[PDB]
Amino acid sequence: ALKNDRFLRALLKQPVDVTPVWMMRQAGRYLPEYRATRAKAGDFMSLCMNPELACEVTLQPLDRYPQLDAAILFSDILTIPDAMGQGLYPRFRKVVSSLADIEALPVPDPEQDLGYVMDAVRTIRRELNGRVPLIGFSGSPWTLATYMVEGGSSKDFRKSKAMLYDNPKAMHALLDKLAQSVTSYLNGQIHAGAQAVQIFDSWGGSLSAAAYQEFSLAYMRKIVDGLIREHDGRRVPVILFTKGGGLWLESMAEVGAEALGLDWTCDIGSARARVGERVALQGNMDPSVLYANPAAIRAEVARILAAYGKGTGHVFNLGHGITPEVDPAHAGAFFEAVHELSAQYHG
Amino acid sequence: MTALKNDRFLRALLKQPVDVTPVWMMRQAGRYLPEYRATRAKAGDFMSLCMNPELACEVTLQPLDRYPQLDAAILFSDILTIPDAMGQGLYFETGEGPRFRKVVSSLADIEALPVPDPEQDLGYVMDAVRTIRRELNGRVPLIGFSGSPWTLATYMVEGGSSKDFRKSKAMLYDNPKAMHALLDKLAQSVTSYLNGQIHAGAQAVQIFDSWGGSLSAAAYQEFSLAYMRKIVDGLIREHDGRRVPVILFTKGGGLWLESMAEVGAEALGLDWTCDIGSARARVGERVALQGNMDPSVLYANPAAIRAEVARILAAYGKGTGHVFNLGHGITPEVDPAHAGAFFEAVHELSAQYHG
Ligand SMILES: [Cl-]
Ligand SMILES: [Cl-]
DSSP, X not given: OOSOOHHHHHHTTXXXXXXXXXXXXXXXXTSHHHHHHHHHHSSHHHHHHOHHXXXXXXXXXXXXXXXOOOEXXXXXXXXXXXXXXXXXXXXXXXOOOSHHHHHHOOOOOHHHHSXXXXXXHHHHHHHHTTSSOEEEEEEOHHHHHHHHHHXXXXXXXXXXXXXXXXXXXXXXXXXXXXXXXXXXXXXXXXXXTOSEEEEEOTTGGGSOHHHHIIIIIHHHHHHHHHSOOEETTEEOOEEEEOTTOGGGHHHHTTSXXXXXXXXXXXXXXXXXXXXXXXXXXXXXXXXXXXXXXXXXXXXXXXXXXXXXXXSSOEEEEESSOOOTTSOHHHHHHHHHHHHHXXXXXXX | OOOOSOOHHHHHHTTOOOSSOOBOOTTOSSTTSHHHHHHHXXXXXXXXXXXXXXXXXXXHHHHHHHOTTXXXXXXXXXXXXXXHHTTSOEEEOTTSOEEESSOOOSHHHHHHOOOOOHHHHOHHHHHHHHHHHHHHTTSSOEEEEEEOXXXXXHHHHHTBOOSSOHHHHHHHHHOHHHHHHHHHHHHHHHHHHHHHHHHHTOSEEEEEXXXXXXXXXXXXXXXXXXXXXXXXXXXXXXXXXXXXXXXXXXXXXXXXXXXHTTSOOSEEEOOTTSOHHHHHHHHTTTOEEEEEEOGGGGGSOHHHHHHHHHHHHHHHOSSSOEEEEESSOOOTTSOHHXXXXXXXXXXXXXXXXXX
């Protein structure tokens, strides 16, 4: 029973009154009410694993900012490797390094092994009461694989890439199991009530053009081929986002997903020319703009709207997550600007 | 016209016929070489090494002696030379990295900054160029270099290394008038610095726009590329009877090659995220291309290194206009033998793409 669905409409190239906006990490430490809930939870994993708390932080930006046109599931990108028994605490107690390691990895069952995520989705979907669509998400196979091979956050992905060039056979094995896992994970979230899904390929941008095709994109394509594309009588749009992936939009546009995420390095007008006929686009403002005065924030919104131009097919967002020191009022000025200034570009 | 024994590097940059694809490597003088680390220890630190022309020459020549395949030398020097000469007080915080005592935050700060004179105020750099040019004895061309105005500006506004560049970009959006004033002054400075290096014997120059890739497409045009264009227009174009090729390198700038190619510089540097075949199709008629291998490949076994060299050569295809390099600097933990396999693969495997 969706009351506001312009976010979905834009992704599906349907007419809209204004350009929709949401923001990566809109539930995060820049919000004092998030910091309160996080302290109430006690630690970050408790917040993630408690569906009531995950819901609480998910709703917080929506209640603060009526301009936001979508909710995104609050969770950790690393749920799946954690579930595989790798012991997430940002590092892993168990680290992938041999083919033998990978073969032993189980493919997590969404409801039996990741039930708390599924519970969070159901809880959020209920509590939203149709106010805005709910976005489910997961990290990409390549991105999750690097976390599992690096053993956590990495200096420069030397180990992950070395293993890629030395033992591509083992890396294929790992990526394939992760593709399997991500597919069922997202399908789980969709069954639980997610109305769109986004794949975050956060580290795909560090790959060479060739390695990106073989070791990241091919596995996102596998996932999209396995996703539930319709639920609750509506299409469930898929958004692929490779940060730093602007060079590669053309191939990304042929995977069959509805939309591609963009970061600020890619001119969105150029992106629309290159692949606009095949996908919706989401993005792409540099988050650092939010540290500037409201006039500058408005000016940058106007520039980006002008670059995209007239008509549907754009969802406004940043090109990366907001950072903890941003003034919530500057975030608000951003969302307001998108709705106020974009109206002229529709109709 | 002064003598070179090997000039295939220059010829590739100028789209002239070459026998093999030339190769050199960013940071080819650096901590991955044990002889470098020994010289650096004898100097005490990096800064002392940069400010002693005899030792800067010594490390500049080391990779050439170890690796006969290398087709160019690059001036060993500090990217932060100019803002130090400007008076901002470069030092090294024990646990972090280079920092400046003084940080740029206002138009008034910027107006006060002087434009260093290369020979009068950076004589130790010009001496290094002269010394290297002499000691090379024409074995390979010498590359001079500088940071770009945008890249230098970020160090001066942040006051050292930064992860997110929040302060630099905040100033870009909040105080464009001041940020442009800084960029303008730095372009003038970089121009005379590079020209001093050329007059001292540099035979090519590379502008390292290391942090230009963090800019939006729109901001890149106004706050970085426009100032590299200023520099290129002001550079000495010929010296010692030769054209002096200019290489512009914005790491992560692959989306922007078309505009970079309109500046008038001979060549553009690429990183591994850009398919070099695609790059050649997009701008190869206008510029030579340098790059573009992922430095991380050098951690892999030599067979993998050769296969990746082979792939990149196949992607560029037949004919001049390519200088092989990494897309980034080599890191200290790469085995010298792996770097060696790399250079040997480029010369051996590229022969078939020429003639
Ligand atoms: Cl744009
Ligand atoms: Cl390539």
